[PDB]
Design a binder for this molecule. Sequence first.
Ligand SMILES: O=C(Nc1ccc(Cl)nc1)c1ccc(F)cc1
Ligand SMILES: O=C(Nc1ccc(Cl)nc1)c1ccc(F)cc1
Ligand SMILES: O=C(Nc1ccc(Cl)nc1)c1ccc(F)cc1
Ligand SMILES: O=C(Nc1ccc(Cl)nc1)c1ccc(F)cc1
Lengths: 250, 250, 250, 250
Amino acid sequence: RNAFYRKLQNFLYNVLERPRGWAFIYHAYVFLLVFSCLVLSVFSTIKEYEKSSEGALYILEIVTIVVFGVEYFVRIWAAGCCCRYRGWRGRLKFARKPFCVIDIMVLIASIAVLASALRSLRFLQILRMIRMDRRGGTWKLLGSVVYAHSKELVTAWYIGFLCLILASFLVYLAEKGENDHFDTYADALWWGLITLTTIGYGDKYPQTWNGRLLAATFTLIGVSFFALPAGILGSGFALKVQEQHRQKHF
Amino acid sequence: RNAFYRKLQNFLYNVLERPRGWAFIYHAYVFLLVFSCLVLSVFSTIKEYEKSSEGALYILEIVTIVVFGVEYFVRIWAAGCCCRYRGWRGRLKFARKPFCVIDIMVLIASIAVLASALRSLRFLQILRMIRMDRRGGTWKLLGSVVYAHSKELVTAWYIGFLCLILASFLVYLAEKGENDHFDTYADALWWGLITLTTIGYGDKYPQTWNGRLLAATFTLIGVSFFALPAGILGSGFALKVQEQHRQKHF
Amino acid sequence: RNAFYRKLQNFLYNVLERPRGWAFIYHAYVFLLVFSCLVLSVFSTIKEYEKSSEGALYILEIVTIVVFGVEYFVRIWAAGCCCRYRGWRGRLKFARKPFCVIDIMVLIASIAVLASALRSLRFLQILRMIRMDRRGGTWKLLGSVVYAHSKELVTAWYIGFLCLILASFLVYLAEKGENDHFDTYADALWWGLITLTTIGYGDKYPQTWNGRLLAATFTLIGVSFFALPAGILGSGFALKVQEQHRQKHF
Amino acid sequence: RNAFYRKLQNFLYNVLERPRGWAFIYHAYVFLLVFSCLVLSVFSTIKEYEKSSEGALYILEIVTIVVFGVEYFVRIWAAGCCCRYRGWRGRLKFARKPFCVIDIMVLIASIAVLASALRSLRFLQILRMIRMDRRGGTWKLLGSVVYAHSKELVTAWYIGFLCLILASFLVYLAEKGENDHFDTYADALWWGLITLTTIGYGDKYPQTWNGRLLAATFTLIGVSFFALPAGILGSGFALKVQEQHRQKHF
Ligand SMILES: O=C(Nc1ccc(Cl)nc1)c1ccc(F)cc1
Ligand SMILES: O=C(Nc1ccc(Cl)nc1)c1ccc(F)cc1
Ligand SMILES: O=C(Nc1ccc(Cl)nc1)c1ccc(F)cc1
Ligand SMILES: O=C(Nc1ccc(Cl)nc1)c1ccc(F)cc1
C-alpha cells in the first residue's frame, strides 16, 4: 500500500524522467500529439482548408494542455523519488530550476492562449517542440562533437568563405555588363552563396564565356569546401560511436 | 543415379537458395529479366511509343511467369536438401512460412493478370523487385547500422527540424508582403524543406534584403544539418566493414 | 660512354615509365598540353570564336603528334632496361601487349586525322585523356575499394531504388489530374530521379497538398539513401589510407 | 616596474601572437569589426541603400586603420619578448619577414585609400580577411590532409572527369537536333558540369527519350564521383583528429 505508494511514485518519476525501454513509447505518443498539432496548424493557415481544421485544432489543443499540465503536476509531486527532494524545501528549490520555471510559465501562457494571435500560436507551437528534449541530450552531444573538431570546422568554413568571395568578385567583373542577373556585388555574392552550397535555384547563372570559364574552375574547388563540415561531423559522430562501443567491449 | 539424385537436388537447393560464386550470375540474369520488364512498362505508358512495346511486354511477361513458377516448384521440391524438411510434414510446414505464402499468392495473381489494369500492373511490377531480396539481407544490414547510430541520427534530424522551423518562420515574416512566393506558412515550410535538403527547385526564393540576409545565415548552418545522416550512416557502413575485415584477419 | 649508354637508356625507361619525384613534372606538362588541346577544341566548336582558334589547334595538334610519337619510339627502344626485354624477341613480345598495340594504332590514326571529322576529333580527344593513366592506377584503386564495399553499395542502391519507385508512383496518383508536369509514369520517374539525387532542375515539382505532403516525407528519407555511396566510398578511401600509413609505421 | 615592463611586453607579444584561451576573444572582436565592414560595403554598393551606409563606413573604416596600425606598432615594439629579437638587429631582420612587409605595405596603402575606387576597396576588403590567419594555420592543415590523400583525390577527380566527358558527348548526340538547350559541345559540357556537381540550375536539361535515358544512368554513377573528395577529405580530417586525440591519451 504505502510501500506500493513509494514504489509507484518512484516509478512515475522514472517514466516521466529518464526512461529506458518502455516509457519511451509513451513519450513517442505525446510527441505524435504535438506533431499533428503542428501539422494541423500549418494546414489551418491556408484559407482553402480553413473550416475543415479549426474544430480539430480546438479539441487537440485542449488535449495538449490537459496532458502537459498533468505531466507537470506529476513532475512536481513525484520529485521526492530520488534522495534529494522531499517535503517542501527540496521540492521548492527544484522548481527553482530553469526548466521547470519556463515550463510552468509556458503552461499558464497556453491557458492564456485558450483564454499576434495566430503568429503567437506559431511561436508557442515552435516552443513545445523544444520541450521534447528535457535533458538537453541532442544539444549536448552536438556541442561535444563540434568542439572536438573546432580546428577543422574553422578551416573548412574559412577557406570556403575565401573561395566564395574570390569567385563572386571574379564572376562579377566578368559578366557585369553582359548579364542582367549580376548587377551589384550583392547579387554576385548571392549567386556564389547559392551555388557553392549546391542549391542552385537557377535565377542567376553566368552567361558569358568568361563567366562560365571562371565558374567552372571555382565550382569544382568550392563545392567541396562548402560540403566539408557535413562530412567532418558525420565521420566524427561515427567514430565516437565506434569508440564508445569498444569501451562497452572493454 | 539416386546418389546423383540427392546430390543434384541438394545443389539445386543451394543455387536457388544461398549462392556463393557461380549461381549469382543466374540470379543476375533473372533480375535483368524483371528489370527490362519494368523499363519496358515505363515506356509502354506513353502513347507515342505504345504499339512498339506491347508485344514485347506480352512475350516477356509470360517468360517471367514461366521462370518464376519453375523456380517456385523447385523451391518446394528441393526443400528436403537440408536436415529438416522431407516427406510431407517438413515441406508442408515450410510452405507455411511467410515468404512462400506471399510468393505463391502473387504467382497465382500474376496468372490472373494474364487471365486498375495498368495501375495494378505497376503495383505487381514493384512487388517483383522485392522478390529479389529473399533472405532480407539488405534490410537487415540497414536496420543494424541505423540502430547502432540511433542517438546521432535523432540529433541530426531533430536539430535540423528545429532549424527548418525557425528559418521558415523568420523568412516568412521578412518577405510576406513583398514576395508573392511566400504567402502562407505552408509555402515558407515548403521553401525551407526544399532548400535545406539542397534540392532548390527554384520556384520560391527570398527576394528581399531581409529575406536574403536571413537565408544566408541559415543555409550555412542548416544545409549541414540536413546532410548529416547521409554522412553518419556512410561512415557507419565503412567502419563496420573495416571491423569485419579485421576479424577475418583475426 | 656505353656505360653511360646503358645508364641513360635505363633512366629514360624509368622516367617514361614509373616516375617517383622528378619525371612527374614532365608528365604534368604533357598533360597540360593535351588538356589545353581539349579546351581549345571545345572553344573551336562555337562559330563565334571559330577563326580565332583554328590555327592554334593546328600547331598544338601537330605538337601532340610530335611528342607522343617520340615518347612511343623511346617506349620501345628503351624497353630492354629491365631484365626481360632485349634484342628483338623480348621487344617483339612486349609490343604484343594490349596497351602498346592500342597506342601505336591510335598514333597512326592520328596521322590519318592530319591526313565525322569534328565528331571523330572529339572522339580521339577523349581517348588521349585515357592515355594519361598507363598503369591503370586509378581504375585499379577504385575497383579495389568498390569490391570490398560490395554489400553496402548494393543495399544503398537497392533501397534507394525501392524508395524512388514508391515515391514516384504515389506522387503520380496524387497529382496526375491536377498537375501538367506529371502526365505519365515516365515523368513521375524523371522527377523522382532528379529530386532524390538532389539535382532539382525545377521543371517538375508537386503542386498539390497531397503531392507536397508525400514528397515531404520521401525526400527526408530518400535523399539520404541516394547520397549514401558517396559517403561509403569516401570513408572507405580514407580508412584504407590510414591502414596503409600505419603499416608504413609498422 | 621595469620587471613589470618586461612581463607586460612579453604578455602583449603573446596575446597579439599565439593566444590560448583569453586573447582569442580579443581577436574575435577585431574579426567582427572587419566582418561588419565587409557586409556594410556589400550593402553600400546598391544605390537604394547608399546614403544610409556611407557615414557608418567612414567611421568604421578609420577605426579599422586605428586598431590595425596600433596592433602593428605593438607587433614590432613587443618583438623582443622571445630570445631572438632585441635592440635593432633582431627587430630589423624580423620586419624583413614576408608577413610584416606585406602588412606594413597594406597599412600605408589603406592610408592612401583614405587619402578603381570602390573596386579597389573590394580588393582591400578581401585582403584584410587574409590577415585573420597570421600563422597560416588553416592553409597548413588543409595542405597536410590533401597531400596524404593525393592518390584518392586524383582518382576521384580523374574518373569523374572521364564520366563528365563521356556523358556530355553522348547526351549531345542524343539531343542536338531535338533540343535547343544543347547546340554546341560547349553547352553539353556546361550541362554536364552543372549536373554532376548536383547544382542543377535548370536551364539545360535533356528533353528526349534518348537524352533522359542516357542521363539517368550517368547521374547515378557520376554524381557519386563528383561528390567523393568532399567525403574523402571529411573522413581524413575526422581520422586525423582521432589519432591526435589518442596520442594525447598516449
Ligand atoms: O514545457 C513546456 N515548454 C518548454 C519550453 C522550453 C523548455 Cl527549455 N522546456 C519546456 C510546455 C508544457 C506545457 C504547455 F502547454 C506548453 C509548454
Ligand atoms: O515471389 C514473388 N513475389 C514476392 C513478393 C514479396 C515477397 Cl516478400 N517475396 C516475393 C513472385 C514470384 C513469381 C511472380 F510471377 C510474381 C511474384
Ligand atoms: O597512347 C595513345 N592512346 C591510348 C589509348 C588507349 C589506351 Cl588504354 N592507351 C593509350 C595515343 C598516343 C599518341 C597519339 F597521337 C594518340 C593516342
Ligand atoms: O595585415 C594586413 N594585411 C595582410 C595582408 C596579407 C597577409 Cl599574408 N597578412 C596581412 C593589414 C593591416 C592593416 C590594414 F589597415 C590593412 C591590412
